[PDB]
Design an enzyme around this catalytic site. Structure first.
Site, PDB file in Angstrom:
ATOM      1  N   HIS A  77      14.703 -72.230 -14.010  1.00 38.02           N
ATOM      2  CA  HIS A  77      14.622 -71.245 -12.949  1.00 38.02           C
ATOM      3  C   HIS A  77      15.417 -69.943 -12.990  1.00 38.02           C
ATOM      4  O   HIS A  77      15.641 -69.315 -11.969  1.00 38.02           O
ATOM      5  CB  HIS A  77      14.600 -71.870 -11.559  1.00 38.02           C
ATOM      6  CG  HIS A  77      13.752 -71.106 -10.587  1.00 38.02           C
ATOM      7  ND1 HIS A  77      14.074 -69.866 -10.084  1.00 38.02           N
ATOM      8  CD2 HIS A  77      12.562 -71.431 -10.026  1.00 38.02           C
ATOM      9  CE1 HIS A  77      13.102 -69.490  -9.255  1.00 38.02           C
ATOM     10  NE2 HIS A  77      12.164 -70.413  -9.193  1.00 38.02           N
TER      11      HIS A  77
ATOM     12  N   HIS B  19      12.776 -76.641 -12.713  1.00 37.18           N
ATOM     13  CA  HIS B  19      12.030 -76.504 -11.482  1.00 37.18           C
ATOM     14  C   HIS B  19      10.557 -76.716 -11.782  1.00 37.18           C
ATOM     15  O   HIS B  19      10.040 -76.214 -12.772  1.00 37.18           O
ATOM     16  CB  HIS B  19      12.238 -75.107 -10.889  1.00 37.18           C
ATOM     17  CG  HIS B  19      11.403 -74.838  -9.677  1.00 37.18           C
ATOM     18  ND1 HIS B  19      11.808 -75.174  -8.403  1.00 37.18           N
ATOM     19  CD2 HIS B  19      10.176 -74.282  -9.541  1.00 37.18           C
ATOM     20  CE1 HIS B  19      10.868 -74.844  -7.536  1.00 37.18           C
ATOM     21  NE2 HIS B  19       9.868 -74.300  -8.200  1.00 37.18           N
TER      22      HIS B  19
ATOM     23  N   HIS C 135      26.351 -89.167 -27.407  1.00 40.73           N
ATOM     24  CA  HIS C 135      27.165 -89.130 -26.198  1.00 40.73           C
ATOM     25  C   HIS C 135      27.148 -90.496 -25.531  1.00 40.73           C
ATOM     26  O   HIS C 135      28.009 -90.785 -24.698  1.00 40.73           O
ATOM     27  CB  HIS C 135      26.662 -88.087 -25.215  1.00 40.73           C
ATOM     28  CG  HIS C 135      26.958 -86.689 -25.632  1.00 40.73           C
ATOM     29  ND1 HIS C 135      26.704 -85.580 -24.856  1.00 40.73           N
ATOM     30  CD2 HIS C 135      27.530 -86.221 -26.771  1.00 40.73           C
ATOM     31  CE1 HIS C 135      27.120 -84.506 -25.537  1.00 40.73           C
ATOM     32  NE2 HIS C 135      27.632 -84.853 -26.704  1.00 40.73           N
TER      33      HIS C 135
ATOM     34  N   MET D  52      19.293 -79.046 -33.999  1.00 46.02           N
ATOM     35  CA  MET D  52      19.683 -80.398 -34.389  1.00 46.02           C
ATOM     36  C   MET D  52      20.302 -81.245 -33.268  1.00 46.02           C
ATOM     37  O   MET D  52      21.493 -81.562 -33.277  1.00 46.02           O
ATOM     38  CB  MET D  52      20.579 -80.345 -35.622  1.00 46.02           C
ATOM     39  CG  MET D  52      20.453 -81.579 -36.478  1.00 46.02           C
ATOM     40  SD  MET D  52      20.970 -81.364 -38.175  1.00 46.02           S
ATOM     41  CE  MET D  52      20.732 -83.060 -38.713  1.00 46.02           C
TER      42      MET D  52
ATOM     43  N   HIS E  40      23.623 -85.338 -31.005  1.00 48.08           N
ATOM     44  CA  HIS E  40      23.502 -84.132 -31.811  1.00 48.08           C
ATOM     45  C   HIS E  40      24.353 -84.161 -33.071  1.00 48.08           C
ATOM     46  O   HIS E  40      25.243 -85.001 -33.234  1.00 48.08           O
ATOM     47  CB  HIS E  40      23.815 -82.865 -30.970  1.00 48.08           C
ATOM     48  CG  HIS E  40      25.215 -82.804 -30.435  1.00 48.08           C
ATOM     49  ND1 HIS E  40      26.303 -82.369 -31.161  1.00 48.08           N
ATOM     50  CD2 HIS E  40      25.703 -83.132 -29.211  1.00 48.08           C
ATOM     51  CE1 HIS E  40      27.396 -82.444 -30.374  1.00 48.08           C
ATOM     52  NE2 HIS E  40      27.090 -82.904 -29.176  1.00 48.08           N
ATOM     53  N   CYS E  41      23.997 -83.299 -34.010  1.00 47.89           N
ATOM     54  CA  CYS E  41      24.741 -83.168 -35.247  1.00 47.89           C
ATOM     55  C   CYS E  41      26.058 -82.460 -34.883  1.00 47.89           C
ATOM     56  O   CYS E  41      26.098 -81.628 -33.972  1.00 47.89           O
ATOM     57  CB  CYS E  41      23.927 -82.331 -36.242  1.00 47.89           C
ATOM     58  SG  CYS E  41      24.748 -82.024 -37.833  1.00 47.89           S
TER      59      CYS E  41
ATOM     60  N   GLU F 223      14.532 -78.861  -5.093  1.00 46.06           N
ATOM     61  CA  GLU F 223      13.596 -77.793  -5.432  1.00 46.06           C
ATOM     62  C   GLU F 223      13.948 -77.408  -6.864  1.00 46.06           C
ATOM     63  O   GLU F 223      13.074 -77.354  -7.718  1.00 46.06           O
ATOM     64  CB  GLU F 223      13.678 -76.585  -4.479  1.00 46.06           C
ATOM     65  CG  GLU F 223      14.985 -75.818  -4.449  1.00 46.06           C
ATOM     66  CD  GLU F 223      15.028 -74.723  -3.366  1.00 46.06           C
ATOM     67  OE1 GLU F 223      14.192 -73.790  -3.363  1.00 46.06           O
ATOM     68  OE2 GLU F 223      15.926 -74.784  -2.517  1.00 46.06           O
ATOM     69  N   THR F 224      15.247 -77.289  -7.133  1.00 43.18           N
ATOM     70  CA  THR F 224      15.794 -76.936  -8.447  1.00 43.18           C
ATOM     71  C   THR F 224      17.105 -77.742  -8.620  1.00 43.18           C
ATOM     72  O   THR F 224      17.762 -78.056  -7.622  1.00 43.18           O
ATOM     73  CB  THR F 224      16.116 -75.408  -8.497  1.00 43.18           C
ATOM     74  OG1 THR F 224      14.921 -74.657  -8.227  1.00 43.18           O
ATOM     75  CG2 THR F 224      16.707 -74.990  -9.846  1.00 43.18           C
TER      76      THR F 224
ATOM     77  N   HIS G 150      25.247 -83.251 -42.921  1.00 46.28           N
ATOM     78  CA  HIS G 150      24.934 -83.460 -41.513  1.00 46.28           C
ATOM     79  C   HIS G 150      25.553 -84.781 -41.085  1.00 46.28           C
ATOM     80  O   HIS G 150      26.070 -85.531 -41.915  1.00 46.28           O
ATOM     81  CB  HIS G 150      23.421 -83.552 -41.296  1.00 46.28           C
ATOM     82  CG  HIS G 150      22.665 -82.331 -41.718  1.00 46.28           C
ATOM     83  ND1 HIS G 150      22.622 -81.204 -40.937  1.00 46.28           N
ATOM     84  CD2 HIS G 150      21.977 -82.110 -42.866  1.00 46.28           C
ATOM     85  CE1 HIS G 150      21.920 -80.324 -41.623  1.00 46.28           C
ATOM     86  NE2 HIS G 150      21.512 -80.829 -42.794  1.00 46.28           N
TER      87      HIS G 150
ATOM     88  N   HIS H 287      24.910 -76.049 -36.264  1.00 46.16           N
ATOM     89  CA  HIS H 287      23.895 -77.085 -36.399  1.00 46.16           C
ATOM     90  C   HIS H 287      23.203 -77.380 -35.080  1.00 46.16           C
ATOM     91  O   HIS H 287      21.990 -77.590 -35.061  1.00 46.16           O
ATOM     92  CB  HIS H 287      24.456 -78.371 -36.999  1.00 46.16           C
ATOM     93  CG  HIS H 287      24.777 -78.258 -38.458  1.00 46.16           C
ATOM     94  ND1 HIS H 287      24.315 -79.173 -39.370  1.00 46.16           N
ATOM     95  CD2 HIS H 287      25.500 -77.307 -39.100  1.00 46.16           C
ATOM     96  CE1 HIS H 287      24.764 -78.764 -40.541  1.00 46.16           C
ATOM     97  NE2 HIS H 287      25.487 -77.638 -40.427  1.00 46.16           N
TER      98      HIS H 287
ATOM     99  N   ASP I  61      26.335 -87.538 -33.583  1.00 46.99           N
ATOM    100  CA  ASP I  61      27.256 -87.892 -32.509  1.00 46.99           C
ATOM    101  C   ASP I  61      26.368 -88.270 -31.311  1.00 46.99           C
ATOM    102  O   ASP I  61      25.488 -87.503 -30.905  1.00 46.99           O
ATOM    103  CB  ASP I  61      28.158 -86.665 -32.202  1.00 46.99           C
ATOM    104  CG  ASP I  61      28.840 -86.700 -30.799  1.00 46.99           C
ATOM    105  OD1 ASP I  61      28.861 -87.738 -30.094  1.00 46.99           O
ATOM    106  OD2 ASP I  61      29.381 -85.635 -30.398  1.00 46.99           O
TER     107      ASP I  61
HETATM  108 CU    CU Z   1      23.363 -80.933 -39.078  1.00 47.20          CU
HETATM  109 CU    CU Z   2      10.468 -70.271  -7.818  1.00 49.64          CU
HETATM  110 CU    CU Z   3      28.445 -83.320 -27.705  1.00 51.41          CU
END
Ligand code: CU
Ligand code: CU
Ligand code: CU
Ligand code: CU
Ligand code: CU
Ligand code: CU
Lengths: 333, 333, 333
Positions: A299, A248, A93, A143, A128-129, A272-273, A88, A138, A91
């Protein structure tokens, strides 16, 4: 330079909860130290007892939320115990260079490593892995998690005025692709490797079998609903490492929303969303005005009610009839 | 207080048309009264005669567009006649509390109810049926519409200058999931309940069989195309209660677009295409500059041209050669 | 008037490269002349030798990027040689009227035509073939590209300060739907027409079999990776004519991003991932700060690593340990 900076160690907590922190920075830049242990484990994700081999950061899906301030240094100790079967890595961001740290963090069972990176940009990011050749496997096995890099002076609205939350919750949404037999029953495996070949074919269909919050259908319901009171300001961080989602709050709104989660941009008002692109973390701020149960959902209602992407908020306080009222209760015409 | 407010009753009209209203409010806050009748009915949605059991608000898919002003009170009388077979309710994304009103509006056939809520946030919102346990089934059977809450001083551009439309149309986009037999032919049922079990399996595939505007493939074409003239400012409200869409006006643009439809945010300029997240309503403003036929579509062209998400606008006026001209008409090399 | 304007002829180049141009306009409005030849051809899109009948503008997938300035006139000569088998046309999202020019540009094999349109709105737009009745088939066969309409004074940040790029690359993302037999093996055809019937059934599933950058799995990798150096400002234009995508630069960020690609709107800052709606072109600006390999991907990782939506950037320069450093290299606990 870094040598001379102060250092604080922080112990992470299980999602949806978040570790203690200061919104407005009270000290200058520090080296914030975290420790995460990789845990490969079986997890039953639904009511019928469907079981999967989850790959987790600290034993949870999603992994825990890390909170630091802009320009602090994040120092992470990553441990892959000998009880695990796979290689594993991680990373971020939030980081710059070496594939977010992925190329510098490859650990086989029995190994550990320590990475340090400068948190130059404020916002919520996904981590994330991502091992060469098995990245999607993964990630879709749970993960992934998120890290919040708060501006040194806290959050602000579009006019530059302060936004202070009383409560913060972390909702990690996960798309799962469980292999099925000819009749449509889900398969079961002994180890992660046994699942591999079938996992790849299941993913290629691009259709998740389950989409859940906090690792399981119904994880944030009943005795596990998120709580608040009328008048409390709540910040809800939501991440999706692989697939788009559209959060939502049923019966409510997102008063201030950073759909793509980067704090140097002014937030969107009265949503709303909102759309959170796969591979991103976003944040919505809201002040509760009515008591009762609220459903927090993705939603696309099929994904929410059929597939598992639904959670609850149970809020306490007095009902406001000016906002809403039943003039004539349901009765025979 | 509310006792003392003036009240006006408004009669709704069939989409794509919108009931008469004032853009800039000429009076103070009022109680705006509406009445909607639930109608369960058979609807043929395509050319081949495919029929479904639609669940509608006022007999239409989508339900009618309600227009009020910020801080007015919306008072809705909801009637579920004894001729219907199912329990229904209504959730307004525009409202605060009780699941948008869903928990206060449950009516069985033969019942009615009256809900009142304060329109505190300006923008276009989605409203839809949402009965506990059968939410996606009612929504994807056409039981959704939208409500527009206009600022008391009308619409404005990014610089705060007034935007006045001459025409307004409401486009409700609907994703349908018709059950199929082994060979791929669509199934037909006697009553809504007979369809239930199969409907659920069809929805879980996450792949609509039809995606239409105004309830049917070709509903807004030919003699039903939307109309305008060169120089007219048109506001197009578009909603999608369950699935993402990406509207596009072929041959034109969205001069001012509120993709997530909330008017307190400045609009996006010169959009070619914009994303409206499932569970949201958005609005685009445009001034026609060229005459002719324009195709208004969901820009995933398979969904538009194969599945049914396409409509027309036929505009009158003089052609402008400065904007566009055929220098050399198609001819043999 | 147009008669009196100066004219310059420009020769297009193969993607990911872009033809020479000025960011800030050095002259006044001109008539910019381009020539494109339609080329129907076989293309192998993956490692296993899967072959398709691509329909291209100038022999490439995507077609070449055209660059002009706001208020210039675009004059395009479109040639469909007698060696082709189908009718084609061109629709520019950048243009106003006649379906973006589609209704004025229908050419059968052996014909040519010349269209002129005024570039009134600044931003990156999609252009694509759109023949009545076979629109999705031509688009998903690779018949699309993009055009950039730069403000006469170049690009600016949210505060109105100038943004100057040193390098620019064009990434066209393509979703393909190859017909399969019962066992799942891809079909092969002699001519485009032979593929037609099956193509339509494959598209209706709404599930691409391949999603690639620059026409093939691995097109922008290995010896074809995009290049840059630490300190260089790079503008990456990305288009998707039919389906949503969510670009992400692994190990980096989008410092300034116009996700819906219209330059009169201020850009979004510090994006980790951004959503480009199907039928749109967007642009991201970034300054490299670390050397090494970066993976540029569509962040639905299954689409990226399983389906083909992944490319590379290999950047030269000195490593910055302040930004990132491995404190303890992977080793036995
Ligand atoms: Cu992993
Ligand atoms: Cu709704
Ligand atoms: Cu990524
Ligand atoms: Cu209903
Ligand atoms: Cu063509
Ligand atoms: Cu188009």
């Amino acid at each position: 330079d870094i040598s001379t900076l102060p250092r604080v160690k922080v112990d992470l907590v299980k999602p949806p909860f978040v570790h203690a922190h200061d919104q407005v920075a009270k000290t200058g830049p520090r080296v914030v130290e975290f420790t995460m242990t990789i845990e490969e484990k079986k997890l039953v994700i639904d009511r019928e007892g469907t079981e999967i081999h989850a790959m987790t950061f600290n034993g949870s899906v999603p992994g825990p939320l890390m909170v630091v301030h802009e320009n602090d240094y994040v120092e992470l100790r990553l441990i892959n115990p000998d009880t695990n079967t796979l290689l594993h890595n991680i990373d971020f961001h939030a980081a710059t260079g070496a594939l977010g740290g992925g190329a510098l963090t490859q650990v086989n069972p029995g190994e550990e490593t320590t990475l340090r990176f400068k948190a130059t940009k404020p916002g919520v990011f996904v981590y994330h892995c991502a091992p060469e050749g098995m990245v999607p496997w993964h990630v879709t096995s749970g993960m992934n998690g998120a890290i919040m890099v708060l501006p040194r002076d806290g959050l602000k609205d579009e006019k530059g005025q302060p936004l202070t939350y009383d409560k913060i919750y972390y909702v990690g949404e996960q798309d799962f692709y469980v292999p099925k037999d000819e009749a449509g029953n889900y398969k079961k495996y002994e180890t992660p490797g046994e699942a591999y070949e079938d996992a790849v074919k299941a993913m290629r269909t691009l259709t998740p079998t389950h989409i859940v919050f906090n690792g399981a259908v119904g994880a944030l319901t009943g005795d596990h609903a998120l709580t608040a009171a009328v008048g409390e300001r709540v910040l809800v961080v939501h991440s999706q490492a692989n697939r788009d989602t559209r959060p939502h709050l049923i019966g409510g709104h997102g008063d201030y929303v950073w759909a793509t989660g980067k704090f140097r941009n002014p937030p969107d008002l009265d949503q709303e969303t909102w759309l959170i692109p796969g591979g991103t973390a976003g944040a919505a701020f809201y002040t509760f005005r009515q008591p009762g149960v609220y459903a927090y959902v993705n939603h696309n209602l099929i994904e929410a009610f059929e597939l598992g992407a639904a959670g609850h908020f149970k809020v306490t306080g007095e009902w406001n009839d000016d906002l809403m009222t039943s003039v004539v209760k349901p009765a025979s015409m």
